[PDB]
Amino acid sequence: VVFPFTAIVGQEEMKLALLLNVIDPKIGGVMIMGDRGTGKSTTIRALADLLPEIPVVANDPFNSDPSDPDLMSDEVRQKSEFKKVQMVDLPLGATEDRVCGTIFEPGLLAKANRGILYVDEVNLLDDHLVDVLLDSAASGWNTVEREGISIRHPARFVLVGSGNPEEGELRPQLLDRFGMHAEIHTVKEPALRVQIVEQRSEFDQNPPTFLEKYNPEQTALQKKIVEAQKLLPEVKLDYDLRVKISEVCSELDVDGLRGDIVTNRAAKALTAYEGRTEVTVDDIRRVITLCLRHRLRKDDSGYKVEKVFARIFGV
Amino acid sequence: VVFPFTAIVGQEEMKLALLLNVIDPKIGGVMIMGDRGTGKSTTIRALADLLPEIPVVANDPFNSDPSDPDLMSDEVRQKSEIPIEFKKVQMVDLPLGATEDRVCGTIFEPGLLAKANRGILYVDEVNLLDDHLVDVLLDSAASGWNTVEREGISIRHPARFVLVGSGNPEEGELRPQLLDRFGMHAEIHTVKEPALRVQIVEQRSEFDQNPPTFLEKYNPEQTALQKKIVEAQKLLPEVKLDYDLRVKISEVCSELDVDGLRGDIVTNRAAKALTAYEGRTEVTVDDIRRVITLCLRHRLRKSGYKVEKVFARIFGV
Amino acid sequence: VVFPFTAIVGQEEMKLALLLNVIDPKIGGVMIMGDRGTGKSTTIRALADLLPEIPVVANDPFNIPIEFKKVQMVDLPLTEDRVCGTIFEPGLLAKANRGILYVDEVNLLDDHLVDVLLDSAASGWNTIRHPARFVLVGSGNPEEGELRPQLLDRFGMHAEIHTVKEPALRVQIVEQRSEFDQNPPTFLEKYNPEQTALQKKIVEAQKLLPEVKLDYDLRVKISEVCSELDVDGLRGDIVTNRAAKALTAYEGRTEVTVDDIRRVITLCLRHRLRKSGYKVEKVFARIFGV
Amino acid sequence: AIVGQEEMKLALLLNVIDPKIGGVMIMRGTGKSTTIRALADLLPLAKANRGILYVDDDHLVDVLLDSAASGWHPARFVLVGRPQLLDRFGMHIHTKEPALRVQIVEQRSEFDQNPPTFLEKYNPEQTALQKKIVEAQKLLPEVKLDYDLRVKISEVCSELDVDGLRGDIVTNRAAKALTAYEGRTEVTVDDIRRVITLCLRHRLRDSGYKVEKVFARIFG
Amino acid sequence: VVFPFTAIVGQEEMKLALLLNVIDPKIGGVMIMGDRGTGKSTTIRALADLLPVDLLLAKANRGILYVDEVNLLDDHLVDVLLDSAASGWNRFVLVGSGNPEEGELRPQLLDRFGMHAEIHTVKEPALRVQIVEQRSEFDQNPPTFLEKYNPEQTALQKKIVEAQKLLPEVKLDYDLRVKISEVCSELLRGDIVTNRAAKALTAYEGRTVDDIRRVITLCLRHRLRRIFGV
């Protein structure tokens, strides 16, 4: 009851950005920054059936797999269904109590453990969850401050928001502390856009029929991700190239130590869709722009990074 | 009894705009700007008294569509018979500064979002209105089903109703983020000939004269519109659009700076209603371009002559 | 009993306007301002007596043999369910039927609560369908604020009391009031003959009202005059037409002449006048050429 | 129970025989209930069909205020106690010489220690006061006010800026009501000057001095 | 739920400065500059730095507090905590934390910053990259990762634990105090703590004027806004 897998073709790099956040949860997140809404909610919801039916336990508000004492918060840890993903968005008008529950009264974040908490126009929210939500992912749990009550039930999510350049982006406080940064371009190919309208008509002609048109293609895309689960083991680079990765920043590593460490793990994922068991050279260059471009403070951006990348690796 | 559906005597363009939206349920957003809310209320009554009968089944509060679609998974699906029923149109307009809980409901108590299965929803002086529940209502246009989850609830009232917008310009434009989802938005301008309005004023007195002879005054004229609209309803699927002409449509909006082709997408579908009204099956390039330009004026962020000048040499001039 | 209608001295403009609304329900409505009414209730109690008895409230608790009820009317309240009704329990909006109520303390009132009054003209029923055809008299308060960009624009005969000194007149009024309050006995007879003639004239005018005559072609001048001003929601022509009809069925002249404009320009235009009287009169004279 | 103290008692006595006049709006007061009890001494809801009530707006009080003129279920009650609520009033003390305090202290000792057998101290005046009230009652609906004098009275409103003028009508009737205990055939400044600012301080828009200065200009 | 304090490296003097006021009850908040992804990590590391809040009064007696550049924080406490600093009673031992780009606090607060600390940036992350790998090693089974460094961490509880019960064995030299007047008094109230600082500084290890000379410029900038013959 949604758009197809490769729907709204064009955000191929964006599809890759979404894939980058997938599989590996240590990336941190993403910040959608484009011209307008453009119906990006479908692109946000494009990973609806993409998530497998992760195993379920009982029917608690928090989405929890069975067993896993590390994932058992209060009752399952002392007590002794393969539910679909439930990624949700964040209402504009909201309060801190709305993101919690006065116990045991739960909260929206707690009920959405291990999910893609969608968000858009984050520039509107001032301070309520600017650092509270950013730091929540690192903790991995939802602590309570209700006097004696202090339940710290585990909290897991994806934490990838969105916003519009018109209302600004942020006073830089946790933007470096946030995940990778990316944006969107302007579609100038009317013929390509014409097929999108045809694709919309294809989506409108018969949702189920259209689905049967590319149903086998949908299965193939999910196949690489499932096998990529085992790809996390090994892939141990000699770190000899990673030695120069820090030296690559140099003038561009003025501040944000934390950021440099994180980009290193990206290469393993970068050399994971390609299937290479060893470290693939030039993949850092393919991810250098998507690494700390927004985090790189300034007054040629990518072009300047590319010019700097010439001395960093040698080309 | 209400004033005649042919008592508009003006705003032909606004009248034409409202009729096309009636024909295609997925047309989009409809709104009218101006300084005469009473005029919008007048059109509201005229629009309400501008449709054939619709069937219900027995008693369903939200909607009792007699087994037309499979969207009866609620109680009717269990019951899938007291179904020999067919009601008429019914408008709906929420009071200003209403209650969100009343707008939503609880559990199951039905909220204010339980009006006609389609259309009916209308909003006068929506320029002020409120920020909360407005985007949800804008999103409710494509919702197709309610979202009830209070205290762990789970219910989805399958309703899909069009909306009509009205608000005085003195209150200012809405938020640009919320300003989107505007399929059609225009304004109505008066004339400096009270003499001409005096006829309608005299007609208003004739309208206020007696309900007798009021229906017989234009019943044959009124019957023509019902037959023409119903005729296009059956032939609506037979729509022919030229891809080469369709290619020009995006090329037409090449210098539009739409900041998102969402508006241009449904803009192509706009000419379908004009073709259905015309009766011609093949797309007429000129008519299509004109309709698209007229509809895109509201979404054109930054007059229509410049767009018309832009339309010149784009569609071919 | 209360003070007689003719016993009231002053506010002749208000008296002329108030009678028009009762004369024809078509009348849009009057609105009145002016702090320190000092008898505002009596100023409206006059219309209560001036009404022929009609068969009303016939064994129906909504207002077999039919009793020719003389008259009935309330003024105003000090809950919304109490204002309308309950579910079938009728509320305060269940007695104004075939009557009229004042708008006392509407300067404060309550937004989104006093709106059913505007949404009450030509109701014909309720929504439980209780017919409603009540009249309304606006009672505003000066210096108490006027937040009605177009909310009170619905007002038709907008006027207010503007007495200044009237020293000898005030003394005479006070003396007459004291005399009337001392003993209504024979105070009724002091002016009894006058009320009957007025009641008969009003009844005759109401009876002959349907045979009114006018001329839209002649009213083209009024249309042009309205065009000279600025309007947004119209209804000005309707107000002018109703005022002209009342003026025709106010002196008995079964025709149309250019005097209703001079009689009711202030009463009609000022209600929706742009945000004065002298300028409106000058414009009307220039348009008419007089 | 207190000798003298006619600064505020005189208004109460004048209003005692003025059922048409109404509106007690006070804003000393240590006696409070005791002062009310002192008022009940100089006197013989449902049972209040013919009586007086004391006040210790909204819904009940606002309805109670209009129930004065709408004293019919007959009420006929005498009330004791924003600009809109100010209209329901026609009449609106002082707690410093130690000599007054010494007399009060001695009276307080006389009252508290000698609650009994102390009636004869004020009984001769209080008992005779009933005849004075009775004498004023019989001739109450007999006196009249001069229209030529009323012109001077009406002239007071010219400089006055308080709207409504209902109290002014009452004030014109107030002077005629007064002087009944006095027994004089007509009413001189005695009734004019004293009762001028008596009700004027309540519905006022130098609180009294300016009014008195205008009154002095208005009066001869 | 703990991290090895000694695992982090760089600006090790700050940890000693943190260790200087770790068991000091008459010290109070100490200024510490250097705000970045690092500062947050170090603060969390400070919490997990030794066993036996930050930026509620009953559960606050005798507790440290990590500031967050209070210049940008609420002024209600700023107008109060500044005077509440060294108030005497209702206790707590906060720690001034922030950055020049993150604010400069208040001038009275600037006039009394206690000990002054800062954190700089160093290139050639030879050890930092290994620390990043150690953090990755810390990421890989943190319950087991801490166990690898646990024996070293285990041999740290009694490093200075018994060095504070009988720490005030001696007192600052009177002649040394007069020598402070040449620079410290010539260029106050903060000097009184610096005067007894050497007793606190040279106590944890096994109980010297070299530490005092080193600590001479440790908090000079906090009061500035050779004396010991150096």
How far apart (Å, rounded) are the C-alpha atoms in residues E78 and E109? Answer: 9
* CB contact set of B255 (below 8 Å; sequence gap of 6+): B310, B314
What residues contact residue C278 under an 8 Å CB cut-off, 6+ apart? none
What is the Cα gyration radius of chain E? 19
Single out the catalytic residue among E112, E135, E189, E213: E189
CA distance D33 to A50: 82
Residue type, D18: D
Q: Which residue has the tokens 């241009």?
A: B264
User: What is the pairing mode between strands B92-93 and B121-123?
Assistant: parallel
Interface test with A, best of E132, E138, E140 (most A CBs within 10 A): E132
Q: What CA–CA distance (Å, rounded) separates B32 from B186?
A: 5
Encode burial over C228-237: b for 16+ CB neighbours within 10 A, e otherwise.
ebebbebbbb
Residues 6+ apart with CB under 8 A from B158: B62, B63, B71, B72, B73, B74, B144, B145, B146
E strand or H helix at C86 = strand C85-86
Q: Which of A108, A118, A98 is nearest to A37 (CA)?
A: A118
Residues 6+ apart with CB under 8 A from E58: none
Query: CA A257 to CA E135: how far, in whole Å?
Result: 13
Reduced to 3 states, what is the DSSP secondary structure of residue C52? coil
Please report, in range form, the residues annotated as the binding site of B.
34-41
**E in contact with C (at least 3 C-beta pairs within 8 A):** no
- E37 known member of a binding site: yes
The partner residues of B164 in beta bridges, in order of sequence, read B30, B122
Can you name the residues that pair with C139 across neighbouring β-strands?
A: C32
Helix (H, G, I), strand (E, B) or coil at C100: strand
The H or E element containing residue A180 is strand A180-181
E36, E124, E133 member nearest A257 (Cβ): E36
Q: Are B245 and B283 in contact (CB under 8 A)?
A: yes
Q: How far apart are CA A62 and CA A84, in angstroms?
A: 13
Largest CA distance in chain A: 63
Relative orientation angle of helices A12-21 and A257-273, to the nearest 10 degrees: 110
**The one catalytic residue among B262, B297, B301, B313:** B262
Residues 6+ apart with CB under 8 A from E216: E183, E184, E194, E227, E228, E230
What residues in C contact D155, CB-CB < 8 Å? 167
Q: Which residue has the tokens 């699927």?
A: B237
Q: What is the dihedral of CA E190, E196, E200, E201, to 10 degrees?
A: 80
Residue B14: its H or E element: helix B12-23
DSSP symbols for chain E: ----GGG--S-HHHHHHHHHTTS-TT----EE---SHHHHHHHHHHHTS----B---GGGTT-EEE---GGGS-HHHHHHHHHHTT------EEE----GGG----HHHHH---SEE-----S--HHHHHHHHHHHHHHSSHHHHHHHHHHHHHTTTTSSSTTTTT--SS---HHHHHHHIIIIIT--HHHHHHHHHHHHHTTSS----HHHHHHHTTSHHHHH--TT--
Question: C170, C160, C137, C193: which is closest to C4 by C-alpha?
Answer: C193
Query: Which chain A residues are closer than 8 Å to E128 by Cβ?
Result: 246, 257
Cα–Cα distance, E92 to E96 (Å, whole number): 13
Domain count, chain C: 1
Report the DSSP beta bridge partners of residue A154: A141
Gap between the Cα atoms of D20 and A249, Å rounded: 97
Widest distance between CA atoms in chain D: 56
> CA D50, D55, D61 angle in degrees (round to 5)?
90
Is any Cβ of chain B less than 8 angstroms from the Cβ of A166? yes
- Tell me which DSSP letter residue A311 carries: I
Which chains, if any, share at least 3 CB pairs under 8 A with chain C? B, D
Q: Testing the interface with A: which of B250, B258, B272 to mutate, by most A Cβ within 10 A? A: B250
Q: Please report where in the chains the tokens 């005692």 appear, as a residue.
A: D16
DSSP character for A61? S
Report the alpha-carbon distance of residue D155 to residue D159 in Å, rounded: 7
Contact A46, A54 (CB under 8 A): no
Instruction: Report the C-alpha gap between E18 and E20 in whole angstroms.
Output: 5
Evaluate whether B95 touches B124 at the Cβ level (below 8 Å): no
Contact C56, C72 (CB under 8 A): yes
Q: Would you call B317 exposed, middle or buried from its count of C-beta atoms within 10 A (0-12, 13-18, 19+)? A: exposed
> Which CA distances in Å does E147 have to A16, C5, C36, E4, E51?
38, 102, 88, 10, 15
**Chain B contact for A165, CB < 8 A?**
no
For residue B167, list its beta bridge partners.
B33
CA distance D9 to D91: 12
C-alpha–C-alpha distance, residues A257 and E10, integer Å:
12
Neighbours of A270 (CB within 10 A): 21
Rounded Cα–Cα distance for residues C243 and C246 (Å): 5
- Tokens, residue B262: 């969402």
- Give the burial class of B52: count Cβ atoms within 10 A of its Cβ; 0-12 exposed, 13-18 middle, 19 or more buried: exposed
Q: How many Å apart are CA A42 and CA E99, to the nearest integer?
A: 42
Tokens of D72: 């019919």
Q: Per the structure block, which two tokens stand in for D148?
A: 């030529």
- Selecting among D37, D166, D184, D217, the annotated active-site residue is D166
Could you say which of B131, B247, B254 has the minimum Cβ distance to residue A194?
Answer: B247
b/e code B220-248 from CB counts within 10 Å (16+ = b): eeeeeeeeebeebeeeeeeeebeeebbeb
Cα separation, B233 vs B285, in Å, equals 22
Residues comprising chain B, all counted:
317
d(CA E94, CA A141): 26
Respond yes or no: is residue A276 known to be catalytic.
no
DSSP string, A227-279: HHHHHSS-----SHHHHHHHHHHGGGGSS-HHHHHHHHHHHHHHHHHS--SSP
For residues E169 and E207, give the distance between their C-alpha atoms in angstroms, rounded to a whole number.
8
Domain span holding position E165: 1-230
Closest CA to A36 of B261, B167, D6: B261
Which residues in chain A have their CB less than 8 angstroms from residue B131's CB? 92-93
Please give the single-letter amino acid code of residue C166: E
How distant, in Å, are the alpha carbons of B316, E7, E179 from that of C273? 49, 81, 90
* Residue E87, annotated as binding a ligand: no
User: How many whole angstroms separate alpha carbon D76 and alpha carbon E3?
Assistant: 87
Interchain CB distance below 8 Å, D158 and C165 = yes
Residues whose CB is less than 8 angstroms from the CB of residue A225 and which lie 6 or more positions away in sequence, other chains included = A19, A22, A23, A50
CA B103 to CA D129: how far, in whole Å? 71
In this structure, how many other beta carbons lie within 10 angstroms of the beta carbon of residue A108? 16
Give whole-number Cα distances, D215 to A18, C167, C176, D7, D172, in Å: 90, 16, 25, 20, 14
Are the beta carbons of A118 and A132 closer than 8 angstroms? no
B194: nearest CB among C112, C150, C227: C227
Question: Is C93 exposed, middle or buried (CB count within 10 Å of its CB: 0-12, 13-18, 19+)?
Answer: buried
Strands C89-90 and C85-86: antiparallel
The maximal CA–CA distance of chain C, rounded, in angstroms, is 59
CB contacts < 8 A (B, C):
49
What whole-number distance in Å separates Cα of residue B156 and Cα of residue D28?
70
For chain D, report the end-to-end CA distance as a whole number of angstroms. 39
Asked if residue A176 lies in contact with residue A293, where contact means CB atoms within 8 angstroms, the answer is no
